[PDB]
């Protein structure tokens, strides 16, 4: 049911995002900007290439990848990371590694909503998204 992730998703709730960003070394001025927008995330597929786009006023980003194939990514906060996206049951797991550390960005569909859990050590952030019509 990978296809249930496809489409356009809008942020409707957040918890611990500011704490998560602080845990990655994102400065207060940038955290303030990042938190005061409700981003849109577009997930699309073309053959075996997936694309994830994030649109806001903090930044626009786009990554393209194949499931299970490591890729280079430069995150919204300017980390150069080694990334991989996998499917673990119903969880779409985006792992970012750099400099001996890591963070996961996990997406799961619960009751039709897309729950994005961001984990960096003990910092855990929940970002709740609703599908656009
Ligand atoms: C450190 C931070 C700026 C990286 C980051 C983490 C999550 C998201 C998602 C799409 C969101 O804002 O929900 C965007 C960018």
From Swiss-Prot:
The modification N-acetylvaline is found at residue 2. The keyword Phosphoprotein applies. Its main location: cytoplasm. One of its GO terms (molecular function) is cytoskeletal protein binding. It is found in: Cytoplasm. (9Z)-octadecenoate binds at residues 127-129. The modification Phosphothreonine is found at residues 8, 30. Hexadecanoate binds at residues 127-129. InterPro entries: Calycin, Fatty_acid-bd, ILBP, Lipocln_cytosolic_FA-bd_dom. The modification Phosphotyrosine is found at residue 20. Belongs to the calycin superfamily. Fatty-acid binding protein (FABP) family. This is Fatty acid-binding protein, heart. It comes from Homo sapiens.
